[PDB]
């Protein structure tokens, strides 16, 4: 809205209460919108007997299509916005402005790939709270979207040439961060919950679990092609993202479930570990949806006025 002349402001995308606010809002959105037939949540406080909370409820088959949310200043506060395209998300920003509201953000719940989001305006950007810590998630922001077309018939398609181009740019940014002499390797998820190990998302109100091995199986700066086809599974028994628990939904009713999304970013983790080897391994990650919100909110902060 209006630029602040000669003003330097510190941003920290990893400690941003806008992220926490958005998170609670999406959890509430899902309560009123995507209701399971049965949901289970653990309760073990007595230290001698557990009592799982079980809720059974009406379970309507409904279309689910995320629409943009705009966050405007909460009472007593103001929203500041960092204008530097390449801003890492943590540190001083010299080009800051005040805005009435954020840009429109679609609250897509997904793992591994970030979908239907904003693209970087210059080069590919990577962000972490601590790059040296192998346990911390790396948020990648692409500067060019990649289409992924999915069907309820059990697969997602991605153009192989575009994906390769994308991987090359990511690896080049990763070696820029971890060493120019490093070989960059992408591998499949090392394990965990199904929602974590596959690229997991919802389409037509159904939960898709697609095998992403073919997307993360290459080596960079070391020395059926046209389309990559990922096998998918639609499931009814789902681990909850909102909190520890499980939900069960009814089977699909539509024989024509079709979605096409733009991949605009990804979530990766680095293997790390003690090694004199001159290579780094990166695997798809995600699961904490706050990282999804961060990927869009990194350039904003709210300040007391």
């Amino acid at each position, epitope marked *: 809205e209006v630029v602040l002349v000669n003003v330097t402001e510190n941003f920290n995308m990893w400690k941003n209460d806008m992220v926490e606010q958005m998170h609670e809002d999406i959890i509430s959105l899902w309560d009123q919108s995507l209701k399971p037939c*049965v949901k289970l949540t653990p309760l073990c406080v007595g230290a001698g007997s557990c009592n*799982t909370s079980v809720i*059974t*409820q009406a379970c309507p088959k409904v279309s689910f299509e995320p629409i943009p949310i705009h966050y405007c200043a909460p009472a007593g506060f103001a929203i500041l916005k960092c204008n530097n395209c390449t801003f890492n998300g943590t540190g001083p920003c010299t080009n800051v402005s005040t805005v009435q509201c954020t840009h429109g953000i679609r609250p897509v719940v997904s793992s591994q790939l970030l979908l239907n989001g904003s693209l970087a305006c210059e080069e590919v950007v990577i962000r972490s709270v601590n790059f040296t810590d192998n346990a911390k998630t790396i948020i990648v922001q692409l500067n060019t979207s990649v289409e992924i077309n999915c069907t309820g018939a059990g697969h997602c398609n991605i153009a192989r040439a575009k994906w390769n181009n994308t991987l090359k740019q990511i690896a080049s940014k990763l070696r820029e961060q971890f060493g120019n002499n490093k070989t960059i390797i992408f591998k499949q998820s090392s394990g965990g919950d199904p929602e974590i190990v596959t690229h997991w998302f919802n389409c037509g109100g159904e939960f898709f*679990y697609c095998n992403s091995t073919q997307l993360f199986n290459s080596t960079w700066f070391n020395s059926g092609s046209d389309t990559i086809t990922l096998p998918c*599974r639609i*499931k*009814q028994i789902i681990n909850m993202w909102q909190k520890v628990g*499980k939900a*069960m939904y009814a089977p699909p009713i539509s024989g024509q479930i079709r979605c096409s999304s733009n991949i605009t970013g990804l979530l990766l983790t680095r293997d790390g570990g003690n090694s004199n080897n001159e290579s780094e391994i990166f695997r798809p990650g995600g699961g904490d949806m706050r990282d999804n919100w961060r990927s869009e909110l990194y350039k904003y902060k709210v300040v007391k006025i």
Partner: antibody, heavy 128, light 110 residues
């Protein structure tokens, strides 16, 4: 396909409780849901309740809520029905039944309400 | 609760002829409707589920029809082993409160 073998006949006084069992063999236990259906002498079938085995969650007929419990023991592939505060009108043959639900261990679940496999029935007589 | 009504209570059919059984629901149950056969002293046997799908091991002379609130079981040519009691079962509701019809007894007309 599962084979369902039920426990033997029971004779109870009114006010007592009973616990009948049903051993499922031949297929993967957690891929099935199990239902209990009763039939009083000369009468029709009455749905009692059904357990979603993988979730360990059971639902019951309204007229029975409170005094019926359905459980499953995954380690022994056995399904149990308990009926408390027995009345003479609880006299019936009690049937355990089940149906395949899909690859439940892989999150697939059709939630089928029909009943493909049936036990041989257990007579429970409730009388003074 | 959903009430299932079968008619007639007893059906008398001459060997080798066609039998038609009816099941009505007190409200729509879509296609969540099953048919069972029961002989004296034995457990019920599933014949049809989803209103019209034949269960494994069920011969083709058994066919189910209908949707919503009215359903039919047709047996195209009665064999000796087809004489029994037939039950319909509603399983449409959630939370589940499944219900049975009171049965139709199919007996031999002589």
């Amino acid at each position: 396909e599962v084979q369902l073998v039920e426990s033997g006949a029971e004779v109870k006084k009114p006010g007592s409780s009973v616990k009948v069992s049903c051993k499922a063999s031949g297929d993967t236990f957690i891929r099935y849901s199990f239902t209990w259906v009763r039939q009083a002498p000369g009468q029709g079938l009455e749905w009692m309740g059904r357990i979603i085995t993988i979730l360990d969650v059971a639902h019951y007929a309204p007229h029975l809520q409170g005094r019926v419990t359905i459980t499953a023991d995954k380690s022994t592939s056995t399904v149990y029905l308990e009926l408390r505060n027995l009345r003479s009108d609880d006299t019936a043959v009690y049937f355990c039944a089940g149906v395949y639900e899909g690859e439940a261990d892989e999150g697939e679940y059709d939630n089928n309400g029909f009943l493909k496999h049936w036990g041989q029935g257990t007579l429970v007589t409730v009388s003074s | 609760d959903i009430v299932m009504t079968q008619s007639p209570a007893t059906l008398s059919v001459s060997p080798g002829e066609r039998a038609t059984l009816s099941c009505r629901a007190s409200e729509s149950v879509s296609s969540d409707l099953a048919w069972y056969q029961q002989k004296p002293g034995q457990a019920p046997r599933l014949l049809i589920y989803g209103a019209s799908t034949r269960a494994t091991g069920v011969p083709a002379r058994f066919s189910g029809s209908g949707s919503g609130a009215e359903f039919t079981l047709t047996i195209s040519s009665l064999q000796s082993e087809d004489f029994a009691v037939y039950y319909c079962q509603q399983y449409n509701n959630w939370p589940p409160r499944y219900t049975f019809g009171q049965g139709t007894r199919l007996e031999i007309k002589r």
